[PDB]
């Protein structure tokens, strides 16, 4: 493989450094081809006021319910708006519109209050009781609260994307506030800095869809070199394993020969790899 | 490398399964060369009453102190009672029964002698642990529930300790006793983890004592005679790792490499949060 490299097994970290921002940070400057060897908390020296750090948050879908209208409809809870009012993924959704009533039990029903621009259904449960409803149904970890506070003091902004995990089945969500911030950051001429490869795949997926105010969906996107990044200007990520698809994505972002040179230097300098290891910033 | 195998990166686990004993368990029977594919909680089906599971517990040394009699380093190892500790003392030849050592104006110690494991027993003055402290994964597959069932079946448990650059093992009196008793009954000493293996096979090569504390330099690779360990529970190790060499010594190299190739084929999860192997 073009993405194979020799990784001494002892460099795969079993536990993280403490504090988390005392991990190593290799910085790659793509246009100049400069590589630097830093510590994570020094990431602030690369960020300017107005840059946007986008983080992914992975959430387990807190209930899956089957209902009847009498078609048999699946309901997946995505986002709570209020006790007993949730944005939901409803399948088959073509059936469900404002006013549609859905019965789960003798003890639980729901009325559709509307449809999101993202394709979800806003459902009000009867009764509005989340406990009943539930009954019926790592790159970011280098950032410490102290670092996040320093960054915000410098004028760096934050946004989040979400990965909703069903259980196999994963839905991304890019909420309205994140869509607005991405657009504002671009307008200001600042950088969208993705934190983690999950964030990258979500953002490059929505960059290729028609414009919406908010997005929810599934992504199949496979990123492999050469690839044009439409939304992501910079990337914080871990050191990935030989032949991994994550290494292929980062190679597309940084340039294959450059990232392979960087990984050979990381092994030589005894960086730690994988989920509890060190980090890379690609600018 | 004789210890290389192709491991798809996606098989290296980032997180453990829950509950812990729902991970896969591959079982290797050395004499018959049989290989089975089980779940961890089923390990009880391979253990009999009187078998001994030996687990390693890692403990950070709870105080490191410098004293003068001049210049002495003191590492706390084991509390006998309040203010009386088995200690590692460096340099040790200079500390004998009756040696006094001052840490501060606030804290002194006297050496009461040496135990059978060679550690120095220090009585501190005052006898006050808080003051003294001021001045200075294979086993995770087991759940509390499984442990309870194993104990109800008559399987016994013992501990070895690793006191932590710079690591000292301890095999306490109660473990030495159970090792011997187990052997006397003709039951199996079952090592949980390669750390346990290294400790037990170290002390097996030493003059007999009732308790041990020391540093191990033992490096296990094929062929090796296991003098204490009758069976092993361990994770799936990475290509070319020294841990894989150790397990190849325990299982036999060709047998273990066949097992690992089958593990990949069946998409077992590898490394510290992955599945497990029992070698009998």
Swiss-Prot record, chain B:
One of its GO terms (molecular function) is S-adenosylmethionine:tRNA ribosyltransferase-isomerase activity. Its EC number is 2.4.99.17. One of its GO terms (biological process) is tRNA wobble guanine modification. Pathway: tRNA modification; tRNA-queuosine biosynthesis. GO terms for cellular component: cytoplasm. It is an enzyme of class 2 (transferase). Belongs to the QueA family. Transfers and isomerizes the ribose moiety from AdoMet to the 7-aminomethyl group of 7-deazaguanine (preQ1-tRNA) to give epoxyqueuosine (oQ-tRNA). This is S-adenosylmethionine:tRNA ribosyltransferase-isomerase. It comes from Thermotoga maritima (strain ATCC 43589 / DSM 3109 / JCM 10099 / NBRC 100826 / MSB8). The gene is queA.
